[PDB]
Amino acid sequence: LEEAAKEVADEVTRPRPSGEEVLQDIQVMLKSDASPSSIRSLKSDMMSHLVKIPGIIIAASAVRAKATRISIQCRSCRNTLTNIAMRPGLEGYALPRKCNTDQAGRPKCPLDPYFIMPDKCKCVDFQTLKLQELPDAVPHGEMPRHMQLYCDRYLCDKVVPGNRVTIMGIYSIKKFGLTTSRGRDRVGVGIRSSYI
Amino acid sequence: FGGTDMKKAIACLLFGGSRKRLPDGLTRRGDINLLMLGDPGTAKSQLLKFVEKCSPIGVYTSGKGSSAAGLTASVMRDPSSRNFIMEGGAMVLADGGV
């Protein structure tokens, strides 16, 4: 849908002023009249689906920068891999280990020769929010529950802590590789931190 | 019931006067201040709540502030990361309000 919106925007606004030929990406937001559902109803069945949830915001971190397109360079032959697309959300990326250049007669590059070039990357805004269950709907004698929210691009700074908000999103998990559990407590097995 | 003069005073309070800065840099207040002294049960608090609801910006407080908010602002320094934090008071949170 974002690609379709970009193509339509290109169609309608072809005679742009000279110099600004570059066609930029378009963020598409969603809105619906469906009645919300309780945050307590979030369980395993709703993973990777679209959910609507009310809440009250209690904490909002600073706006930071996250990369969407990166380029890396080789140590020895200074070759470059460009325009690598990053994944949205809280997901990382692993650099390759082999230099993919045909070199016969020439000696070859060493192991792990790649470095990230910072000045040749595309960056977007990034924010994390903390959401609490509404006091109007918290069960009697039960501690309120919390959730972490991910905000990208134009959704940043639209909410001030203390506001009562209704949020439509995707229920997901963080992906930073198969790291070993830490701390002196290691009871939990196969648990990935969740967010929206 | 009653208090037509009081209601008109409240209306002109809500509209308010005009502020005027001067070439010397000195300023003169453009807002109105009212006081109501009376016996208990004279319908004073209700007018204050109606004013709080009627004005586009309005804060209702008592003496000594509120439950978890002071009446005037305060400033502190965060020891871990050195930042000058200020806590909004009931007076600072209102600008152009009542």
Binding site: - | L34, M36, L37, T42, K44
Partner: protein, 49 residues
Amino acid sequence: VFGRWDETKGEDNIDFMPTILSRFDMIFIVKDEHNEERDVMLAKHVITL
């Protein structure tokens, strides 16, 4: 100051010093005035509301 107004005492019914009282623009004084026929109207107005 005493909890209810005392008309004959005049001054000293207000505890504020004149400095803070100067900043006010208008000062209103309200009293529980005895009117036998006004109480009926007030009660009827309240019940009608």
